[PDB]
Design a protein around this nucleic acid. Sequence first.
RNA 1: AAGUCUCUAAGCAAUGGAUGUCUUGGCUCCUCACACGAUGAAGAACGUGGCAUAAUGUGUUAAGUAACCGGAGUUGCAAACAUCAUGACAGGUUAAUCUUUGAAUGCAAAUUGCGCUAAACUCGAUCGAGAAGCAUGGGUGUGACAGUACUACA
RNA 2: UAUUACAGAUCCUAAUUGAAGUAGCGAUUAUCCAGGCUUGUAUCCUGGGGGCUGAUGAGGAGUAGGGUUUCUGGACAACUU
RNA 3: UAGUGUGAACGAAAGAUGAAAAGAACUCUAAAACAGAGGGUGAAAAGUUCCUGAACUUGCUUAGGGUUAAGGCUAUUUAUA
RNA 4: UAAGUCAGAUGGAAUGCUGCGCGAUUCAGAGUAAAAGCCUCGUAUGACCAACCGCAAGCUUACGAUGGACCGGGGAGAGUC
RNA 5: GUAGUCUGCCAUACGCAGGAAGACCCGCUGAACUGAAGCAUCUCAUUAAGCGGAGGAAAAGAAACUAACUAGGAUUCCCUU
Lengths: 134, 50, 122, 77
Amino acid sequence: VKTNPFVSSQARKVRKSYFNAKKDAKHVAMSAPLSKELQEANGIKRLPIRRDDEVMIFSGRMQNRTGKVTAVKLSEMRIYVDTFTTEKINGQAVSFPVHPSNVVITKLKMDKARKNLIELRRLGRDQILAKLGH
Amino acid sequence: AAHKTLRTKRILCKAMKVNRPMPQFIRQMTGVRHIRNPLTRHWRRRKMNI
Amino acid sequence: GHLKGKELIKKTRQELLDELAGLEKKLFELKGQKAASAAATKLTEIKNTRRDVARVKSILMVSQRKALQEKYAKAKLVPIDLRKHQEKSLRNKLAPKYANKLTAQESRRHKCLFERKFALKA
Amino acid sequence: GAGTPSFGPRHNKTHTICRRCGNCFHIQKSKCAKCGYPDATMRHYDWEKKAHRKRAQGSGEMRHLKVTFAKLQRAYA
RNA sequence: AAGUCUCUAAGCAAUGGAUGUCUUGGCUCCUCACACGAUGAAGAACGUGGCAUAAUGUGUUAAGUAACCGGAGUUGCAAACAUCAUGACAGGUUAAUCUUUGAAUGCAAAUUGCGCUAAACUCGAUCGAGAAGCAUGGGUGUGACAGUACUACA
RNA sequence: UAUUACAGAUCCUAAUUGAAGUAGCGAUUAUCCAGGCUUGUAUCCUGGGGGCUGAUGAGGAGUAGGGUUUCUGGACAACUU
RNA sequence: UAGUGUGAACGAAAGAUGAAAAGAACUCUAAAACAGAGGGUGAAAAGUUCCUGAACUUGCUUAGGGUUAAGGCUAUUUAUA
RNA sequence: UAAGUCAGAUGGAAUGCUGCGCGAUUCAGAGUAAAAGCCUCGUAUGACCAACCGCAAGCUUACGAUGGACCGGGGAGAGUC
RNA sequence: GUAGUCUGCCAUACGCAGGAAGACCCGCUGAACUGAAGCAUCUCAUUAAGCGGAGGAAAAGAAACUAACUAGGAUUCCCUU
C-alpha cells in the first residue's frame, strides 16, 4: 500500500499520465529484459530499447527470429523490427509492430548514456541484494 | 463593392482563402476521419455579416 | 552549410555582418527559384538558411547586450531595455529595509527589550 | 404591408465592425454594443455572467499570463 | 364457391440505433496559490510549417533562434541531419526577437488619413531618408513669464 | 444505500408508418428540322426555318448591398420541381 | 464550434473496425472510380459515423383465416358454439 | 531498488486452466494480442552526491539601555461632543 | 528703475496613476415577485441588479469597555446564552 499522497491510485488519472507523459518517461516505459548471455555480462535484467540493438520474440506468427529495430514509436507505443514482415495482397512487405515487454534483447550497442546508465544500475543492484541478504 | 475600404478588403481576402476543402494528408497523419473545415461556406446560402 | 551557435561567439561583429548579408542573399535566390523548380531537397535548404539567419541575428544581439549592459551597469537610472523584468506589484512595493526601519524611540528601547532566548530547568 | 414588401429597402448597415471587440459598433451612436468602446472600461454586467465568460480571460491566447501561472506551480509543489 | 388482396404466426434479410459491455470526459469535497499591466496586460485582427482550413505554438529571428537543464529519432508521406558527441528533437525553463491593434498614449479614424524633432544611431553621395522619439493628470526639483499683490532702497 | 419499476401528461428527445406512387410538377414568347460531341440531348454547341422581347426592353452601365458570383480548363455523388 | 438575429444576446447534433490495416491485389460482365460476380486478407467480415444490432415499418419464403372491422375469454375431436 | 518472459494442453495471442518454485519496508495502480505479487513502468524504503550556506534590522559592557520609589512639573484632538 | 517675497500660469528632468479579474472583502445606492390566504404599515431585505474601491486575504483593533462580583480587561472567529 502507498504512503505518498501525491501519487494517485485512480485508474483514470494513471492512464492519462501514462499516455500523455513527457518524452523522457516514455523511453523508460518502452523497455525489456536481456537474454541470460547478456545478463551475466552486463549485470542487469531490465533496459530501455534503442534503434541500434536487436531483439527476439517468443510466441507468435513471427516466433523465434532475431532482428534489428528499425524504429521505436512512442505515441503508437510499439516497436518496428527488421524481418518481422507479412506481405500485403500486393507484393509489398510491411513491418509489423510489437510491444517490447513481450520481447527479449539478444544483442546491445553502447552509447555514452547507455554505459553511464548500466554502471549506475550495477552498483545499485549490489547494494540492494546485500540489504535484503540473499 | 466597389469602393471597399482596405480593412474591409482584408476581411474579404481572409474569407475566401479560408474557403476550401480540408487537405488529404491530415486524415493520413492523425487517422481521425470526418473533420470538416468549419469556415467553409457558400456565398449565396450563408451571408458573412461582416 | 549550417553552423553552430558556440563558434560564432569567437568571431568579430563586422565579420558576422558580412557573414549575415551573404547568408541572407542565398535565402532570396532560393525564394525566387521555388516557384520555377519547386520539389524536394530545396525545401529543406530554404528551411535551414531561415534557421541560420536567426542564429546570426541572435548571437549578434547577445554580443551587443552583454557589452552594452557593462557600460550602464553600476550607475544610476539605467535604460528600460537593460532593467530586469519583474512584476508591477514587486517594483512598487518598497524595499524591506524602509518598511522595517526603526524609530529613534523604538531602536533605543530595542537595545534592552529585544526578543531574547530563555529556557527552564528539568 | 409590414412583411415581405417592406423587407425590400433593407440595404443600409446599422452596425459596423468594432476595433476593440472586432465583432456591432453603432455607426450613428458610435459605440460598440458588445464591449462599450470607446469607454476606457470594458462592458460587462453581473446579469450576463454567462455571456461575459465567453469574452473574458481564458478565451484568448494568454501569452504573457500563462507563463505567470506556470511559475506559481513550480514554487509551490 | 376466386384471390398474388387483406389478417395472424415462424424463419432468413433490408431499415433503424435500443439493450449489454467499454471510458485519456465530467460532477462534487478537501488541499496549495493568486507574484496580470506604460518594462505595453486581458481581449481582437492578420501572418507564419514541405504537403496545414480550425485549434495549438509563435511574430519577417514567425511550428521557432540563443543559453542552461534533459539526452537519441514522440505519427502518414517526402527530405535532411545526428551518434562513446563539434550532442538528434514535439522535451522543460530563462533571455532575445516581439507584425496591425487594444488602458492605447503625437492629432484622428466606417480613412492604412494628417503631423513634429537638439545631438547620436544607420544606410544614403554638406543635405535627404529610415530607425527611435513626442499623450493626459498629478508629485518633487529646475527654469521662464505675468501682476498698479506686499515691502524696502532710490 | 438510492437520480429505483410507466401506456397516457395537446409530455421530452430520437427514429418510422398509413394516407400514396396519390395531391401535384406553377408563373415566364413557341417551338420545329438536319448536323456536331457522346454509352446517352427537345435541353450542350453549329446551320436553317417559325417566333418573342419591341428603347422605363430579361439591351448597354452604375450607387447602396453582395464578396469572387468574374475568366479558362476538367467534373456530374448532390442541387438547378 | 456549426448556425440565428440590425443588435443586446442565443446556441446544438456528433464516442466504440480489428490484437495488428493485414483497409481488399488480379480477372470477368459493363460506356465506366455505376453496380455486382469470382478470388483473396483475418481467429471471426467485424469491410470504413464498420462491436452487440432490440422494437415500429418493409421484402422474400413457408402455413392457415376472411359476407360478420379486428382482437380477447371459456370449452373441446381446431373451426365451430 | 525484490522475485518465473517456469513446465504441459487449448488458442490468432496466456496474465486464465492443472502442477512445482521464488519475493515482500514493495499484493497502491497502470501497460502488455485474454483475468499478472514475480513480462515493463512503478509502488516501498532508506541510502547515496551535487547545489547552496545570504538578505535587511539590531548587537557588542558602561553614568549604555530599561524599570521601581521619592521630589518638583506641562498638556492631552471644536462647526466637534 | 532693482531685490526680495506672495500669488498665478507655462515649459522641462525623473519615477507614479489609469486597463484586466472581481468567488471572498470595503463604502454607497436600492427594487419587486413573494408572505400576511385581500391590502396600504410590516415581510421578502438593510437581499438581487446598479455605481465606486482594495488584497492574498480584507475589514476590525489597544477602552469616554463590561459590570455590580469571592470581579473581568484590545480586535476577530467557533460553541452556548
